[PDB]
Amino acid sequence: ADKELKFLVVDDFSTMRRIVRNLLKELGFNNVEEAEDGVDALNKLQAGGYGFVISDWNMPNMDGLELLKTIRADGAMSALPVLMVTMEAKKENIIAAAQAGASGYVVKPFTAATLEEKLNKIFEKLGM
Ligand code: BEF
Ligand SMILES: [Mn+2]
Ligand SMILES: [Mn+2]
Numbered sequence: 272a273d274k275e276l277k278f279l280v281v282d283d284f285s286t287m288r289r290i291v292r293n294l295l296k297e298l299g300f301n302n303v304e305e306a307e308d309g310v311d312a313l314n315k316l317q318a319g320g321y322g323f324v325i326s327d328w329n330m331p332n333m334d335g336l337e338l339l340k341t342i343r344a345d346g347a348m349s350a351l352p353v354l355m356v357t358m359e360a361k362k363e364n365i366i367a368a369a370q371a372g373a374s375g376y377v378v379k380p381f382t383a384a385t386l387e388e389k390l391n392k393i394f395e396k397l398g399m
């Protein structure tokens with residue numbers, strides 16, 4: 272994928288955003304912004320430029336499933352890749368996110384290898 276691809280990393284806890292931002296750096300992506308909830312995210316997204324979203328589920332203001340649904344329902348960003356990264360591991364959550372259009376889904380805690388594999392899976396599926 273283009274190493275200038277702009278990522279938005281969303282989670283209500285800085286620890287997790289920090290892990291993901293650093294992993295992306297390792298993979299060669301330095302164009303990375305953070306958001307703290309679904310609303311914060313949509314604000315940055317509607318500020319334009321973004322090529323990929325990585326998002327938590329449980330967050331105040333707007334959760335990640337609502338964020339995913341909003342993104343997929345907006346004609347201007349409906350195809351934006353959205354990778355869920357969340358502690359929700361139940362099959363009903365995976366189903367609900369998948370059905371809502373998640374590009375991929377990683378369960379916390381995750382390894383560096385896992386994030387890399389699932390990002391690449393999405394890149395390949397989308398021809399990025
Ligand atoms: F808060 Be997340 F869903 F891990
Ligand atoms: Mn914090
Ligand atoms: Mn744009």
Ligand SMILES: [Mn+2]
Binds near residue numbers: 282284328
């Ligand atoms: Mn959370």
